[PDB]
Amino acid sequence: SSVKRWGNSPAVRIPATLMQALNLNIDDEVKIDLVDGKLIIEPV
Amino acid sequence: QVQLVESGGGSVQAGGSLRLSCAASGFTYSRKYMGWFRQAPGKEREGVAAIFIDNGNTIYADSVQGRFTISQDNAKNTVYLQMNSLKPEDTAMYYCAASSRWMDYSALTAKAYNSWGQGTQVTVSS
Numbered sequence: 201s202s203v204k205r206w207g208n209s210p211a212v213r214i215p216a217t218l219m220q221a222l223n224l225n226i227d228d229e230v231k232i233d234l235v236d237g238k239l240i241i242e243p244v
Numbered sequence: 245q246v247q248l249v250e251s252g253g254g255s256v257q258a259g260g261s262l263r264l265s266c267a268a269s270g271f272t273y274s275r276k277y278m279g280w281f282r283q284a285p286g287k288e289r290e291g292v293a294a295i296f297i298d299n300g301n302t303i304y305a306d307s308v309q310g311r312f313t314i315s316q317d318n319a320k321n322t323v324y325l326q327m328n329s330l331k332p333e334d335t336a337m338y339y340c341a342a343s344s345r346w347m348d349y350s351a352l353t354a355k356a357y358n359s360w361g362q363g364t365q366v367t368v369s370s
Contacts, residue, residue: 215348216347216351217276217277217296217347220294220296221276221277221298221299223301
């Protein structure tokens with residue numbers, strides 16, 4: 201996995217098994233934050 | 245990535261329950277999710293349940309949702325498939341599977357797994 205350019209904006213693609221692991225559907229709002237040098241993303 | 249051993253198979257009367265188990269060994273800490281697949285006589289293998297190791301979240305195929313439930317004991321590196329209200333159509337060879345990677349396929353599909361058990365037979369008498 202790597203950071204790619206979508207538009208003129210950095211973006212990371214999320215594999216299907218990760219969407220299912222978090223019960224995330226397209227457009228689900230998520231909270232992004234930086235914790236312990238890691239990018240954290242949790243569903244709202 | 246891990247070796248898988250299923251157990252618990254057997255013959256049960258229709259309407260009954262049965263609990264299957266799957267013990268993983270090897271690089272058990274690499275497991276992202278594990279699932280149960282089954283092959284009924286003459287048919288293609290289908291995914292029935294999956295469980296994500298880190299958060300215990302589960303997903304099920306329409307054919308068994310509500311009747312089958314998958315759980316885990318991470319201490320023992322094992323996953324279980326509880327089957328309630330079994331019916332003759334549930335007769336099949338049940339296989340345990342595991343993935344050490346976050347594949348871009350549904351966890352209810354075979355392409356999402358890279359480790360497979362030998363299967364345990366479940367027969368439900370009409």
